[PDB]
Amino acid sequence: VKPNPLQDANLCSRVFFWWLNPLFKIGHKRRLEEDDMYSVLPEDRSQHLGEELQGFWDKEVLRAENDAQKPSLTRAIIKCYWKSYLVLGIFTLIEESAKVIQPIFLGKIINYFENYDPMDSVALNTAYAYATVLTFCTLILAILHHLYFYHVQCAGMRLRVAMCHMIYRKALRLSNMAMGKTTTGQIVNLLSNDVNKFDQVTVFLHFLWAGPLQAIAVTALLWMEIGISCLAGMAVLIILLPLQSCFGKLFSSLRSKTATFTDARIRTMNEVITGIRIIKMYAWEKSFSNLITNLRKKEISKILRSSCLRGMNLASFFSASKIIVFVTFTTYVLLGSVITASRVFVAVTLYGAVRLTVTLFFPSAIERVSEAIVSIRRIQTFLLLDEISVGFQAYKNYFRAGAHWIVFIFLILLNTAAQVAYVLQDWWLSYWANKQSMLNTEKLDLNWYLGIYSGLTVATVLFGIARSLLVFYVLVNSSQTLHNKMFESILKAPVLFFDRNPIGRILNRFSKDIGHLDDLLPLTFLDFIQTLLQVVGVVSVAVAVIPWIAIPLVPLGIIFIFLRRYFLETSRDVKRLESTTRSPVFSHLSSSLQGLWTIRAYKAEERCQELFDAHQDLHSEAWFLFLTTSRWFAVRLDAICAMFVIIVAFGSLILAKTLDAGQVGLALSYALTLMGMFQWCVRQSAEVENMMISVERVIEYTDLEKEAPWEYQKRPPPAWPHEGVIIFDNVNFMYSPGGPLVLKHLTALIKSQEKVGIVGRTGAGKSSLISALFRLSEPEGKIWIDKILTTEIGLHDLRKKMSIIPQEPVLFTGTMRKNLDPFNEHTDEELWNALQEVQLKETIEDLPGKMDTELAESGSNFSVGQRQLVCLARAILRKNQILIIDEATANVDPRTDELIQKKIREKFAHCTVLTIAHRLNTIIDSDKIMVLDSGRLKEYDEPYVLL
């Protein structure tokens, strides 16, 4: 078998994940296929995780049925995992208490600089001890966290597998009456969507009691430093809760109505791609073009508002750390107290540790718990029924299509000012403290120091909103300008491009690639850019105070570039492995429920359980590597993130004769916030480069094959088709320019007022002549028609002056007035005349509207009869000379074909009919008959010499 190195591995080797080093060496240069993944632990099998939960549930059902109450499933999980969760909670409490001691010991180092004496050896040792104590909370938070996180993540897959095991076990005991209601789709959905919500619940389950505790623990510490002025900092942070939720209820609505404009358009596409040979033959491209162009404008106008709302939300999330500090400190100063550099940065650190945690971790645990409870209720109600007895080019082509190169310089200059203001607003307070500490009653005027601070506070918000708005607009304009190019490039492709590519591929592209281009790209781009810009500012602030922290920065930054690549090279296969191991489980589940009555004949219902367990163990193995490979990188990242802080603190302490308290506090208060932003910035690039593939495959289009232009300046006479004379010569045809033939050298010439017919068996080149004079694939061979040719004329002025009767009639979703005449070139009464001349006016007045009656789903309300008859009515109203009749019959012998053939008898007056015959008797009193066998003709004038 495949033993895993997770076991038989001592301590101090599982905190750094040292047992996963060899696997990387295999994934770096060999592309492991399926047999380089380790097995699962003996306590992670399906049969072990399912039987104990089944026993607990069977005991709970009896316990809750003997006494008159309802059986509950939520208790059967707490009766099992309570010990594990409360054991894990110890480290949660430890790491939550460790995040409060750091700002307490941060303020004790600045106090040493505030009272400095160059001849003193007792306080330096105390400062070193304080630094050593502070240098360990970071290590505790950075190193020992990734094992507890892996454990709390693994604590969910066990339940996820145990639920599916008993679900499948129950799915084989359903009666014939209970199965008549329950479909296979809802069962595979319950097993495919409702059980996947148990993976992210245990991660956010510990915030419901750690939020309010930490809030009070920090609020109690602010009173000892500043006083009442902390309330002015806590009164704003609460207001952010109802404001960010109410507007949420305003956003979701704007997301729903847009769907109404998104699906319908797609539906229209499903009717233009299926039937190109009819739309292109009738020259009806402009109608569908105008019908499609109108919906995209409304879709963009509805998307812009939601984009602006999301941009405003992000701008409010960016610069929310400046209002609280400004308010609390102007309140603290206006009361009559003196500002010092010992409490400012401590309060800043406390506020920054509180607000993010609260406003990002509290409103999500409730959603997670609600989804989990809904899923658990569904699964419980299900089990209670009775039983039986890329590259730089991909970015350049995507960015340069949005705006000119001036807007890019403008947005760069706009992005490179918000961070400068963000840093200067906090530097001004350090300058104020340093200027105040140098006094000996010669007080400081508040006007200047309070006006500069307000200006620096307002500029930050302004430059934070403008950048987001501009970025969102520029990135939406790109999709707006690419969708067009896609449409007018795909609309002009020849029939050879549609006869080989499936419709589902094109529809899937047009839907999901444009959805990705419109919805999630600008948000992720802006978030990544903001999180990346937030780190260079911290690095520059750290460097500008101590210029000697630029020497180790190069070795600390060189390692990351290689580490990211060395990780991705082997991490870019776990997703494929997981999907390939996950799909067969659903496949087997869906295919095993149909042939179920034969599994009851031979009473073997436990072998299928073992097969299901074996199928799920592969997905379990493929999922076990994901968490470990994801945690392998965070430890090495946090190592550098903590070494940076250690170096900063110690190098700043060992230079206590050059610097002062304000700037050491400033440099120390920023280094404690890098660990989260670095992780977020590293994470966002993954999704960016993952979703750029849709952009790249969108740009794959917009440059395809193209037929001849629609029209030239070679205008034919306005009365060109006055007489039907079609000559021929030895023409050879090939669909592809280098494939086989389907037809060979039809040489003839058709007279005017002549009813010519062709006799042949299906497959000998009989159904390809309509593709010749319609030039669907421009061949060699010069075809003269009425003093002009068929090659030096545009495609529209050649197919419009010709009529065609299709084999199988097609109808589009619209009005009866538009289906017979999209481009209005006639009056009102002529439509009634042409429709009664073909003898159908029952259905119209049997219906109310009878002129604007919309159809539905390809007009299934009608039959082949009136469909063929309305195609005949189109041929009637066309008012044309050349008529090509095709015959592919599946209809019945009664009055339909008699009526249509009599109408083609008397209605058509002396107009050059070219007919294709499938039954030898449909030709009645023909004038010219040709027989076309397996590659040429034996043609004669009259049928009297044939037989």
Task: Mark the binding-site residues for ATP, compressed into ranges.
Answer: 760-767
Handedness of CA 110, 111, 113, 119 (dihedral sign): negative
Residue type at position 343: R
Task: Compute the least distance from the CB of residue 564 to ligand MTX, in Å.
Answer: 9
Least gap, CB of 200 to ligand MTX (angstroms): 11
User: Of the two residues 515 and 676, which places its CB atom closer to ligand MTX in the complex?
Assistant: 676
Q: Nearer Cβ to ligand MTX, position 360 or 789?
A: 360
- 314 versus 421: smaller Cβ distance to ligand MTX: 314
Lookup result for tokens 């040429």: 936
- Backbone phi and psi for residue 940, each to the nearest 5 degrees, phi listed first: -145, 160
Q: Per CB under 6 A, does 477 bind ligand MTX?
A: no
Cα dihedral across residues 440, 446, 448, 451: positive or negative: positive
Which secondary structure element, helix H or strand E, spans residue 488, and what is its range? helix 446-490
Question: Which residues, in sequence order, are bridge partners of residue 932?
Answer: 937
- Asked if 345 and 668 count as a contact pair (C-beta separation under 8 A), the reply is yes
Determine, following the binding rule CB under 6 A, whether residue 507 of this chain makes contact with ligand MTX.
no
Nearer to ligand MTX, 645 or 932 (CB): 645
* Euclidean distance between CA atoms 162 and 46, whole angstroms: 7
Q: How far is the CB of 366 from ligand MTX (least distance, A)?
A: 17
Binding segment for ligand MTX (CB under 6 A), chosen from 329-337, 676-684, 732-740, 798-806, is: 676-684
Q: For residues 52 and 55, what is the distance between their CA atoms, to the nearest angstrom?
A: 5
| Of the residues 523, 682, 855, 931, which one makes contact with ligand MTX according to CB under 6 A | 682
Question: In angstroms, what is the minimal distance from the CB of 205 to ligand MTX?
Answer: 15
Residue 143 is a binding residue for ligand MTX (CB under 6 A): no
> Is residue 16 at the binding interface for ligand MTX, with CB under 6 A as the rule?
no
Within 10 A of 761 (CB to CB), how many other CB atoms are there?
Answer: 10
Note whether 54 and 41 are within 8 A (CB). no
According to CB under 6 A, which residues from 631 to 660 bind ligand MTX?
A: 633-634
Smallest separation (angstroms) from ligand MTX to the CB of 198: 18
Q: How would you class 258 by CB atoms within 10 Å of its CB: exposed for 0-12, middle for 13-18, buried for 19 or more? A: buried
**Measured distance CA(785)–CA(727) in Å, rounded:** 7
Write down the least CB distance from residue 529 to ligand MTX, Å.
12
Q: Which is nearer to ligand MTX, 682 or 937 (CB)?
A: 682
**CA distances to 232, 456, 627 from 322, in Å:** 13, 10, 37
| Residue range at the interface with ligand MTX (CB under 6 A); choices 248-256, 677-685, 767-775, 819-827 | 677-685
Cα–Cα distance for residue pair 107/666, rounded to 1 Å:
12
Torsion of the alpha carbons at 555, 561, 563 and 568, rounded to the nearest 10: 180
DSSP labels for 77-93?
A: HHHHHHHHHHHHHHHHH
| Least Å from the CB of residue 683 to ligand MTX | 4
Q: Is 685 in the site for ligand MTX (CB under 6 A)?
A: no
Annotated binding site: 760-767
Q: Is 905 in the site for ligand MTX (CB under 6 A)?
A: no
Instruction: Kindly tell me which of 560 and 680 has the beta carbon lying closer to ligand MTX.
Output: 680
**By CB under 6 A, residue 565 contacts ligand MTX:** no
The stretch among 30-38, 216-224, 232-240, 679-687 that binds ligand MTX (CB under 6 A) is 679-687
Rounded to whole angstroms, the Cα distance separating 128 from 31 reads 50
Closest distance to ligand MTX from the beta carbon of 531 (Å)? 6
Out of 248, 676, 717, 935, the residue judged to bind ligand MTX by CB under 6 A: 676
Candidates 78-86, 267-275, 486-494, 674-682; binding stretch for ligand MTX (CB under 6 A): 674-682
The answer to the question of residue 680 lying near ligand MTX (CB under 6 A) is yes
Q: For residue 386, what are the CA distances in angstroms to 71, 173, 174, 376?
A: 15, 9, 7, 19
With beta carbons less than 8 A apart as the criterion, state whether 403 and 477 touch: yes
Q: Is 79 in the site for ligand MTX (CB under 6 A)?
A: no
Interaction residues for ligand MTX, span 349-408 (CB under 6 A): 360
Residue nearer to ligand MTX on the CB measure, 243 or 373: 243
Residues 616-635: x where in contact with ligand MTX by CB under 6 A, - otherwise, as a string: --------------x--xx-
CB of 48 to ligand MTX, least distance (A): 28
Q: Interface with ligand MTX includes 679 (CB under 6 A)? A: yes
Spatial contact of 623 and 44, defined as CB atoms under 8 Å apart: no
First to last CA, the chain: 80
CA-based radius of gyration for the chain: 39
Question: In whole angstroms, what is the distance from residue 197 CA to residue 376 CA?
Answer: 10
DSSP track, 321-386: TTHHHHHHHHHHHHHT----TTTHHHHHHHHHHHHHHHHHHHHHHHHHHHHHHHHHHHHHHHT-S-
Closer residue to ligand MTX in complex, CB, 352/716: 352
Work out the burial of residue 822: count CB atoms within 10 Å of its CB; fewer than 13 is exposed, 13-18 middle, 19 or more buried. Answer: middle
Nearest distance, CB of residue 348 and ligand MTX, angstroms: 16
Q: Which of 683, 706, 782, 895 binds ligand MTX (CB under 6 A)?
A: 683
Please identify, using beta-carbon distances, which residue of 219 and 630 lies nearer to ligand MTX.
Answer: 630
Site residue total, ligand MTX (CB under 6 A): 11
- Give residues 516-545 in contact with ligand MTX (rule: CB under 6 A): 531
Closer Cβ to ligand MTX, 472 or 528, answer by number: 528
**Half-sphere exposure of residue 71: CA atoms within 13 angstroms, side-chain side:** 19
Binding of residue 306 to ligand MTX (CB under 6 A):
no
Among the listed ranges 5-13, 245-253, 680-688, 850-858, the one in contact with ligand MTX (CB under 6 A) is 680-688
935 is a site residue for ligand MTX (CB under 6 A): no
**CB 676 to ligand MTX: min, Å:** 3
**130: contact with ligand MTX by CB under 6 A:** no
CB nearer to ligand MTX: pick between 196 and 836: 196
Q: Which residues bind ligand MTX (CB under 6 A)?
A: 360, 531, 630, 633-634, 676-677, 679-680, 682-683
